Structure 1
Amino acid sequence: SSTISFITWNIDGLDGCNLPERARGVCSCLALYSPDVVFLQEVIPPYCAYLKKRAASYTIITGNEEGYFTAILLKKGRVKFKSQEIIPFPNTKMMRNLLCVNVSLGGNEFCLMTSHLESTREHSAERIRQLKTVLGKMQEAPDSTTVIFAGDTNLRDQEVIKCGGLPDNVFDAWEFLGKPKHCQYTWDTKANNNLRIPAAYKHRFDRIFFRAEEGHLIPQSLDLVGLEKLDCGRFPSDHWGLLCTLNVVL
């Protein structure tokens, strides 16, 4: 009743192979789960055009119009759009930024945020600086609003540790749920074959952070999506997506 739902997913728009099957896979997931909000990363303009035709029950807010970029989709008749804000990462080398959408949903106000933090091992320093910027913006939000960040952070655990960890008032949804093993890795070369990497690597790149008054926002479930291998023998993306439901109390 007062439950809200969202999916966050890096859909790998930079991979040009099997795009029509993969996009159908993404739109199938979105239509069948029909979450209130969808956070997307690594979208490209033809992918955006596809979503407008094949996911028309959502209003699409985008992080850029060129290259690859993020987007937030809002369920028509369920989410009320109030404002949009985009904040640059001045030192990015990969056009990354912070997309914020303020909405009303189920009678409550939310600041929804997504980003695709700087990629690869060698760009650890800038990734960490971007993480700090995001957390900073979460904390500067009006306390009247509930802030939810969901995105592809590209983080390694040691990177969070070395920068001091999350602030006391920002929670990681996966940690909040007791670190369940079933959705621990969202990028996994043994379970996912899209990149054709021989060695076995696995990471929790996709993460959900939230800031809210005590007891107000209670994560209920977190599951992987995009697990069905497609006709071509690959997955919709090199990432699993995350589907989260949360209860909103008063």
Structure 2
Amino acid sequence: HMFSLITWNIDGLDLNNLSERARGVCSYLALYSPDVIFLQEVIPPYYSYLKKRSSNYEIITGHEEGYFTAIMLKKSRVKLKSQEIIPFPSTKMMRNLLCVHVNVSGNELCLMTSHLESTRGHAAERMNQLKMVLKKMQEAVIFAGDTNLRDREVTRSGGLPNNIVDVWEFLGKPKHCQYTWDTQMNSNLGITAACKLRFDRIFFRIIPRSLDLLGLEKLDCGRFPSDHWGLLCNLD
């Protein structure tokens, strides 16, 4: 029938004006009203707002302390079958892989999210994190989350497998959503340098329809909802 999802690193560690940014993030989720949501970098206070505002979603957290990922499932349409938190081994940043087995319209496709290593120097540790993601996908599939991948690190990690495709590259490599982390346009960072990267990615095992950016409008306090852009992929 139809399907949608939203990946967004809400940047929950950035405590400044977070009460207003979280009211903007919710306002984006309310108008679009997706079926599945993949959030990264969520602090316990941030999880408290989404629990009270978005009352029609069954949230599954990846941890409890620090920051963690989160999956929100449209309770009216998506049914919970299973849920599991597979942690990364040699992770030095309190990071894990969050998978949830659901059933939408009678179809068996699981949902995954993660927040791979943020460190740029810890590239091999991130690439080893990438390999365990693709190895778990083939073992169950729609992955989505802050990957922090760049500079052909997917190539040097052995490349993507045949059964796993990237929704961006699969849609003819569209240009409007080429970069989810844009230090040029997004000025929540004050970075005088200009770099653009595609961090938030979406891997597929249903056919993806569209892909678009979220949170491009500055709020009333002059700051964006997040340093990352929100991703939105429709399907059928």
Indicate the TM-score class for this superposition, using the shorter chain for normalisation: over 0.9
CA distance in 2, matches of 1:201, 1:209: 24
Where does residue 162 of structure 1 map in the other structure? 156
**2:216 aligns with one of 199, 219, 227:** 227
CA distance in 2, matches of 1:157, 1:112: 26
Where does residue 181 of structure 1 map in the other structure? 175
CA distance in 2, matches of 1:112, 1:157: 26
Summarize the alignment of residues 7-156 of structure 1 with structure 2, pairs less than 5 Å apart: 7-141=6-140, 147-156=141-150
1:241 aligned partner, one-letter code? G
CA distance in 1, matches of 2:160, 2:28: 31
**1:192 aligns with one of 186, 189, 208:** 186
1:132 aligned partner, one-letter code? K
CA RMSD of aligned residues (A): 0.8
Count of matched residue positions in the alignment of Structure 1 and Structure 2: 236
Identity of aligned residues (%): 78
| Misfit runs of 4+, over 2 Å | none
Deviation, structure 1 residue 218: 1.0
Where does residue 214 of structure 1 map in the other structure? none
TM-score, scaled to structure 1 = 0.93
Structure 2: gaps (5+ residues): none
1:174 aligned counterpart, secondary structure: helix
Deviation sequence 1:90-122 (CA, Å, 0-9, x none): 111111101010001122122100000001211
Deviation, structure 1 residue 81: 0.4
1:237 aligned partner, one-letter code? S
Deviation sequence 1:184-234 (CA, Å, 0-9, x none): 1000011100111110011000000011xxxxx211000001111111111
2:108 aligned counterpart, secondary structure: strand
CA distance in 2, matches of 1:152, 1:166: 17
1:117 aligned partner, one-letter code? L
TM-score, scaled to structure 2 = 0.98
CA distance in 1, matches of 2:91, 2:182: 26
CA distance in 2, matches of 1:140, 1:104: 17
CA distance in 2, matches of 1:24, 1:157: 34
1:98 aligned counterpart, secondary structure: strand
Deviation sequence 1:124-172 (CA, Å, 0-9, x none): 111100000000000111xxxxx00001000004211111210111000
CA distance in 1, matches of 2:109, 2:48: 27
CA distance in 2, matches of 1:226, 1:96: 25
CA distance in 2, matches of 1:83, 1:58: 15
